Design a binder for these strands. Structure first.
Length: 215
RNA sequence: ACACA
RNA sequence: ACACA
């Protein structure tokens, strides 16, 4: 139905600031479709390359975030000319252990299953944000002290509810700008939850909201 | 802005 | 403890 990119690979630039990393960049556009792998490059003062399902994931990433503002800087996006990303040697990152990472086996892929694709929803970016896999008492109190500990600006509005699951909470958030919700997406997605007596943490997840409000 | 793959 | 109030 929809159009597709000219390559299974994608290119991004403007990653000069220390706030960018392969985990943060790749999950931001991962909410837009199925992904494969990501790779950083030393050949520029701040750039990287990505491999994804090119139809829906590289089209929508180029439709919604490519050269949008983030962290007080820009994250340029456009199509690659490479045939595919190759693993091998690396040099590490300022916020990562390797210049390379893999997601082809990750559950983070939102379109990887028919039980997700039947209820999935996608829209243009906004200052509104949605979350799932969050504590029952996560509200403005846990959202405020978590963002302030990471040095990130806290949201301007918060909402939390139930009935979506009995295992974990869900709700909406909002910021004073679209780039403010996007930079907080980079720092809070896949973040580990705390537990009062649990044997291990479980990760929180978030993405651009389609809700009608955040309060 | 297209790799110590 | 994987996706829209």
């Amino acid at each position: 139905y929809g159009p597709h990119a000219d390559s299974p690979v994608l290119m991004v630039y403007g990653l000069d600031q220390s706030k960018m990393n392969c985990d943060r960049v790749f999950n931001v556009f991962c909410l837009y479709g199925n992904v494969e792998k990501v790779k950083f490059m030393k050949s520029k003062p701040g750039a990287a390359m990505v491999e994804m399902a090119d139809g829906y994931a590289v089209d929508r990433a180029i439709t919604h975030l490519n050269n949008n503002f983030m962290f007080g800087q820009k994250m340029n996006v456009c199509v690659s000319k490479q045939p595919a990303i190759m693993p091998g040697q690396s040099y590490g990152l300022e916020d990562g252990s390797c210049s390379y990472k893999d997601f082809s086996e990750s559950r983070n892929n939102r379109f990887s299953t028919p039980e997700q694709a039947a209820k999935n929803r996608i829209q243009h970016p906004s200052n509104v944000l949605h979350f799932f896999n969050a504590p029952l008492e996560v509200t403005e109190e846990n959202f405020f002290e978590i963002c302030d500990e990471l040095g990130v600006k806290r949201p301007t509005s918060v909402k939390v509810f139930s009935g979506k699951s009995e295992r974990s909470s869900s709700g909406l958030l909002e910021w004073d700008s679209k780039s403010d919700a996007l930079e907080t997406l980079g720092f809070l997605n896949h973040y580990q939850m705390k537990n009062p007596n649990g044997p291990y943490p479980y990760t929180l997840k978030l993405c651009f909201s389609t809700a009608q409000h955040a309060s």
